[PDB]
Amino acid sequence: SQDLSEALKEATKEVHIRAENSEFMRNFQKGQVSREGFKLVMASLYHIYTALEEEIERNKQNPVYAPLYFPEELHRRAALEQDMAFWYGPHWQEAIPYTPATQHYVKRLHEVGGTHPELLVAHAYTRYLGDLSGGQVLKKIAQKAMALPSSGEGLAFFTFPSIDNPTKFKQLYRARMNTLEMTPEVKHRVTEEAKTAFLLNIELFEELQALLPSSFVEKMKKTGRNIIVFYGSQTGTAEEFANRLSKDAHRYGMRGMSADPEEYDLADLSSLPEIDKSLVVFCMATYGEGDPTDNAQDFYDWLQETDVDLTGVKFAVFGLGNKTYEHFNAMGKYVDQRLEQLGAQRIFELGLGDDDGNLEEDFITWREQFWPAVCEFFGVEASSIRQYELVVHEDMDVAKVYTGEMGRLKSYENQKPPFDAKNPFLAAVTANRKLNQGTERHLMHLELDISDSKIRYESGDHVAVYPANDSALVNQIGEILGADLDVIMSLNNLDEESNKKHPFPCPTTYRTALTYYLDITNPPRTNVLYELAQYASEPSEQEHLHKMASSSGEGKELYLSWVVEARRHILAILQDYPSLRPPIDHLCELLPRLQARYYSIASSSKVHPNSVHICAVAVEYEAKSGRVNKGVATSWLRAKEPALVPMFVRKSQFRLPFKSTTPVIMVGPGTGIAPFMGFIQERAWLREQGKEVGETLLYYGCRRSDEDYLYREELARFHKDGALTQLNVAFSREQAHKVYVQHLLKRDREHLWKLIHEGGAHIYVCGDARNMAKDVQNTFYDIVAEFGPMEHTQAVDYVKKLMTKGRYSLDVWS
């Protein structure tokens, strides 16, 4: 094509098909990779990436490569050295081979980096863009096939801790590629060199291949079990889940086993109701185009043409899927919907695990609320064995007790770089003023001083903050529970081979754990209500707590109405149910951890290098339970007057264009103006350095001009200086019909189209506003359809292509 990214994708089509059809890569896809062949590819890759990054460092400021310099995000030499130490021992430096094909690849890399740097892109593309695609699945396949530690040793090459979204980063990288100015002949040479790089990889793979040459019903009867968990897996995740489920079975009054459904004629589901309180669980991953895992293919086929009467059978299904596919959890949904068709009844709601997000968290939630539903269905209300043991330290020094820090002991006082999620830096609150002019809501602008933290950030990055619960809540809970909060103690997991030895940093007091480590504000999950039912004196409230553990029936109605919809925290539950007098250690075992909260950085590191600006709206509402609830992080930050805040910075892919001449179209209603401020700052800064800056358009939205017009004065000053080219503000509540930013974009359709088409502008969409991103998206669809004469389908294809080339970026949240 014309844009370099599309030209590279099209030019390297056949060679990519060929590379992934090589015998070595095909054996890899099928899970048949050997430790020796894996050591071979990894050593070759060490040599290759050493050469590649050597030449990258050599040309990191050459204009023909400069926009692609992403050392912190992409480079591999460090991880490859870690993996060499893993796979070849301490003296790997002389133990790793250097095959002729690897030397050919390295020689070509050095030729390019030395005498033809204009082609270096073609090689980075072939490697880095590849590592951010198939590599994510290859890492799982390796973990399972070779049996590596779950800690990630040996597969550090496949891990990008600075890239939280490889799709968005690939968009950013394509954008940086298309910025490269080059003549058409040079573009053709670059595509040919990308073909050459693919061919080098192909012949490397070829050379490395050259260097290799009893029915479960009666079974459960004789083994004495009532639970069986079939796993439909390909890369071991569903197997792991099924094994952990059947492991929880034995420690709950019941007794289960995790089995493979492949070698069992599941006609033994009709023979299963003849086991006392029997139930079967299915952890089903889905592949292909809504196709079952191979180990369940037979099973799937069996459910097609069958009529086995499965009356009185108890089942539950958890599905493993990915929201990016458009057959989301087809296998799990099919098994769930179909077992009820055959006669069985659902005990717990079907789980829908997303792999785009945190699949582990989805599964932990599902299991956590599943086990109570089982214990409350069959009525086997024995009340289960604990998981953490209380050990009070009545005489113990204070320099050994956790006082709220997150990582190592006394890490909040002995601050040493680097600072990240496990070692947050305590930034000094320099400013905390009100942006909101009215009184509808309180919107605040904080500034955090990070002078000598050595923390780097860019406009568009995010800042995460570890908050503290309101101390009045902690005191009230400690009062109504009738316990002492300053008691130094510990909770030790007696699941001995679970290296998760505590629920939170220990030893510490109950006050400290309630203040910094636990989430005492979000509505409680079903599991804590079940485990609290045994502490209710009155059988009315005990029976309420029990029934609230039923996923089916009016128990779910009660749970959703009185807890979720009413938004009752733990204190509200302890208040309205005065029968509840549980201990404090069991409560600290049942409550979920206090999560950090993310905010869009509202400053540019080029004008505010030692400061990070946050723009937030304080959460505070009258819940339907009567009480007035407060947002943890926003209330905690609101009280901060210039006063430390534990924070860290997470890289995003929201980035201004490399060329200062490129125009930007920012759209951000409400708090979504947060990053754009930074943008504008940096943009203004580029004008002050004497650089030529393109158009900078802002489409902001608020209610009233005198109510919540955030940064009105600063935006006005930016506009009058020329830094902010257009200030298009849509006031939603200044007449009878509401005016949103969609209408302002629709208004300037002609100029916007000339910016996008002729100027090659970047579009940014940001903010909380629900259903707003899709409205802006449809607006741009219509603009492109109208002004560049197109069918609606051609226009949506055009806009999607823009998203691929990193010219339509999103940063939405809730």
Number of alpha carbons in the 13 Å side-chain half-sphere of residue 353: 26
State the SS3 of 189-224. Answer: HHHHHHHHHHHHHHHHHHHHHHCCCCCHHHHHHHHC
> Within positions 232 to 251, which residues make up the interface with ligand FMN, using CB under 6 A?
233-238
Q: Which does 329 bind (CB under 5 to 8 A by kind): ligand HEM, ligand FMN, ligand FAD, none?
A: ligand FMN
- Shortest distance, CB of residue 619 to ligand FAD, whole angstroms? 4
Annotation-wise, does 229 bind a ligand?
no
Annotation-wise, does 355 bind a ligand?
yes
CB 223 within 8 A of CB 230: no
CB 279 within 8 A of CB 312: no
Footprint on this chain of ligand FAD (rule: CB under 6 A): 462, 521, 567, 597-600, 615-617, 619, 621, 623, 631-634, 671, 674, 813
Give the span between the Cα atoms of 476 and 192, in whole angstroms. Answer: 70
Joined tokens for residue 297 = 């293919």
> Which range in 119-127, 433-441, 660-668, 737-745 contacts ligand HEM by CB under 6 A?
119-127
Question: Where are any strands of DSSP class E within 380-483?
Answer: 388-392, 425-434, 443-449, 462-465
Give the span between the Cα atoms of 407 and 422, in whole angstroms. Answer: 5
- Shortest distance, CB of residue 39 to ligand HEM, whole angstroms? 18
- The type of residue at 200 is L
CB 556 within 8 A of CB 565: no
CB 620 within 8 A of CB 425: no
Within 8 A by CB and 6+ apart from 174, the residues are 5, 804, 805, 806
Q: How large is the C-alpha radius of gyration of the chain?
A: 29
> Within positions 103 to 162, which residues make up the interface with ligand FMN, using CB under 6 A?
137, 140
Within 8 A by CB and 6+ apart from 127, the residues are 48, 49, 52, 197
Binding track over 142-181 against ligand HEM, x by CB under 6 A: ----------------------------x-----------
Q: How long is the chain?
A: 814
Give the span between the Cα atoms of 516 and 405, in whole angstroms. Answer: 8
3-state SS class at 443: strand
Q: Which residue in 189, 327, 746, 747 binds ligand FMN (CB under 6 A)?
A: 327
285 binds ligand FMN (CB under 6 A): yes
329 binds ligand FMN (CB under 6 A): yes
C-alpha distances in Å from residue 382, one per residue of 11, 379, 531, 537: 65, 9, 11, 17
Which residue number, 19 or 373, has a Cβ lying nearer to ligand HEM?
19
Annotation-wise, does 521 bind a ligand?
no
- Shortest distance, CB of residue 229 to ligand HEM, whole angstroms? 30
Helix or strand (DSSP H, E) at 81: helix 77-88
Which residue number, 377 or 599, has a Cβ lying nearer to ligand FAD?
599
Query: What backbone torsions phi and psi does residue 490 show, to the nearest 5 degrees?
Result: -155, 155
Helix or strand (DSSP H, E) at 478: helix 471-481
Which residue number, 248 or 461, has a Cβ lying nearer to ligand FAD?
461
Instruction: Tell me the site size for ligand FMN, rule CB under 6 A.
Output: 25
- Shortest distance, CB of residue 346 to ligand FAD, whole angstroms? 27
Which residue number, 48 or 464, has a Cβ lying nearer to ligand HEM?
48
Q: Which residue in 38, 87, 125, 559 binds ligand HEM (CB under 6 A)?
A: 125
126 binds ligand HEM (CB under 6 A): yes
Within 8 A by CB and 6+ apart from 19, the residues are 25, 198, 201, 202, 205
1: β partners: none
Annotation-wise, does 621 bind a ligand?
yes
Which residue number, 171 or 191, has a Cβ lying nearer to ligand FAD?
171
Number of alpha carbons in the 13 Å side-chain half-sphere of residue 548: 25
Annotation-wise, does 50 bind a ligand?
no
9 binds ligand HEM (CB under 6 A): yes
Annotation-wise, does 238 bind a ligand?
yes
> Within positions 340 to 379, which residues make up the interface with ligand FMN, using CB under 6 A?
355, 359
328 binds ligand FMN (CB under 6 A): yes
What residues are annotated to the active site? 600, 766, 811, 813
Give the span between the Cα atoms of 91 and 30, in whole angstroms. Answer: 32
Q: Which residue in 102, 179, 286, 515 binds ligand FMN (CB under 6 A)?
A: 286
- Shortest distance, CB of residue 125 to ligand HEM, whole angstroms? 5
Q: Which residue in 4, 11, 16, 670 binds ligand HEM (CB under 6 A)?
A: 16
- Shortest distance, CB of residue 465 to ligand FAD, whole angstroms? 8
Q: Which does 810 bind (CB under 5 to 8 A by kind): ligand HEM, ligand FAD, ligand FMN, none?
A: none
The CA-CA-CA angle for residues 305, 311, 312, to 5°, reads 140
Annotation-wise, does 285 bind a ligand?
yes
CB 767 within 8 A of CB 671: yes
Binding track over 32-71 against ligand HEM, x by CB under 6 A: ----------------------------------------
- Shortest distance, CB of residue 156 to ligand FMN, whole angstroms? 20
Give the span between the Cα atoms of 27 and 31, in whole angstroms. Answer: 6
- Shortest distance, CB of residue 42 to ligand FMN, whole angstroms? 22
Annotation-wise, does 412 bind a ligand?
no
Beta strands 628-630; 227-232: pairing state: unpaired
Q: Which residue in 321, 372, 523, 670 binds ligand FMN (CB under 6 A)?
A: 321
> Which range in 86-94, 125-133, 558-566, 581-589 contacts ligand HEM by CB under 6 A?
125-133
Point out the residue whose Cβ comes nearest to ligand FMN: 321
Q: Give me the residues that bind ligand FMN (CB under 6 A), please.
A: 137, 140, 233-238, 285-290, 293, 320-322, 325, 327-330, 355, 359
Residue ranges in contact with ligand HEM by CB under 6 A: 5, 8-9, 16, 19-20, 25, 28-29, 125-127, 129-130, 133-134, 138, 170, 201
Mark the binding-site residues for FAD, compressed into ranges. 567, 597-600, 615-617, 621, 631-634, 813
Binding site residue list for heme b: 9, 16, 125, 174
